[PDB]
């Protein structure tokens, strides 16, 4: 099985166009001989110089965020400009955005409802806390989040979407999550998703995994039966990303 | 008196290559015969775009939000990476990040002291709402928004700051602001000005008028005594933007 992977570069708040123009160069020059998608979501500023300095067809570029429409939102970039500016592929519902920034279950899935409707491919992120995570709610807590979004989706439109699963309960924490862990909260979306929108949708479905991914742990977490690729964080800012690609063959 | 005033377009969250590249066109070929400012705000987007195309020397480019520092704030654009990019200018605590965007009048403080620091010249949006303006509570309000600006520069600092004045309350309420209201807002804010901080800083300190202007309106409005420009919202996306331009003389 197992639909073709994904390697997403999640640059977030980082990068100076020294330090990324290398990094570009390096991806240009990688032999990449397994098909893969890989995605690189650098900030909005950068889009523009990756977008002319990448040229590996292997790679696509992506926004970390946006709203669903122009106007008057000082500082804030919507789905339109990005559409115009040649951007396909968006990350949504970030658990950063969702500490930091205000984003509920609703607003993530109004942001993938538009996306979507644009014809954006979405990354859309969910996963629970440590609190969440203590108290046994990890079924509960991702199955809502999932559900919330997919409320406002047909079954077509999930042709768009791929599902990044974030261990936020990891994240900072001192706990440490296992590849088995890894594996278990992801077949437990699968579950649902064969379920609720049907086993053929389910077994198309890219599910990412969004926690701590180094050249080291890659492979083995790939291994794993139900996850589809990474949403990389840190080590995505670093010649080792290129390790995390070759992990998914 | 009058120091050298200053006409920002702030573009909020508009823009299409296309529209973006004909006006840029126009200003460009715009004859500025007096000592004014002038100064975009685009999207984080645009800035490549516009950065390349625009060339006129009297204009400079500005962003319209940022944090602080980089890192782990996926969908953010940090002062370091603008300074990197070459972005020297710099829009901060607009009403529309207050009322959306969880802005206090704490975080826009400690994001001008971060710009500030980091060099940029800044301007810094405050004013009241429907509510406080009917219940008498301008002066208190404005003031109070000042001083926790002022609560974390030194005298110094105030060489690269802006004051923009916005009549919230005047903001899509019904409700309509004369020139007069205008200029009383800013005399009020210049005074407080003179008296915290020094007449010196006073008499040089600009503060722009961030309500509804207009070519027709623009003009009246620069007749007063204590306005030094606008940071203009919708007619910036426009051909009389050059008007607005013109009224500064």
Same mark, same amino acid.
Request: hydrophobic share 30%.
């Given at each position: 099985s197992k639909?073709?992977?994904? !390697?997403? !570069?999640?640059?977030?708040?980082?990068?100076?166009?020294?330090?990324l123009s290398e990094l570009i160069d390096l991806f240009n020059s990688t032999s990449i001989n397994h098909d893969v998608q890989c995605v690189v979501a650098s900030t909005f500023v950068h889009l523009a110089m990756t977008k002319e300095r990448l040229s590996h067809p292997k790679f696509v570029i992506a926004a970390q965020n946006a709203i669903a429409k122009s106007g008057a939102f000082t500082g804030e970039v919507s789905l339109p400009i990005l559409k115009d500016f040649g951007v396909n592929w968006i990350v949504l519902g970030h658990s950063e955005r969702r500490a930091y920034y205000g984003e509920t279950n609703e607003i993530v899935a109004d942001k993938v409802a538009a996306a979507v409707a644009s014809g954006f491919m979405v990354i859309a992120c969910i996963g629970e806390t440590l609190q969440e995570r203590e108290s046994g709610r990890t079924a509960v807590v991702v199955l809502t989040q999932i559900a919330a979004i997919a409320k406002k989706l047909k079954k077509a439109d999930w042709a768009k979407v791929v599902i990044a699963y974030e261990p936020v309960w990891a994240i900072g924490t001192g706990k440490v999550a296992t590849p088995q862990q890894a594996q278990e909260a992801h077949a437990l979306i699968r579950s649902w998703v064969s379920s609720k929108i049907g086993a053929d949708v389910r077994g198309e479905l890219?599910?990412?995994?969004?926690?701590?991914?180094?050249?080291?742990?890659?492979?083995?977490?790939?291994?794993?039966?139900?996850?589809?690729?990474?949403?990389?964080g840190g080590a995505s800012l670093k010649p080792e990303f290129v390790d995390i690609i070759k992990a998914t063959q």
């Open positions: 639909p073709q992977p994904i !390697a997403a !570069a999640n640059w977030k708040c980082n990068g100076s166009q020294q330090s890219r599910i990412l995994y969004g926690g701590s991914v180094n050249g080291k742990n890659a492979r083995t977490l790939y291994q794993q039966r139900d996850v589809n690729g990474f949403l990389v």
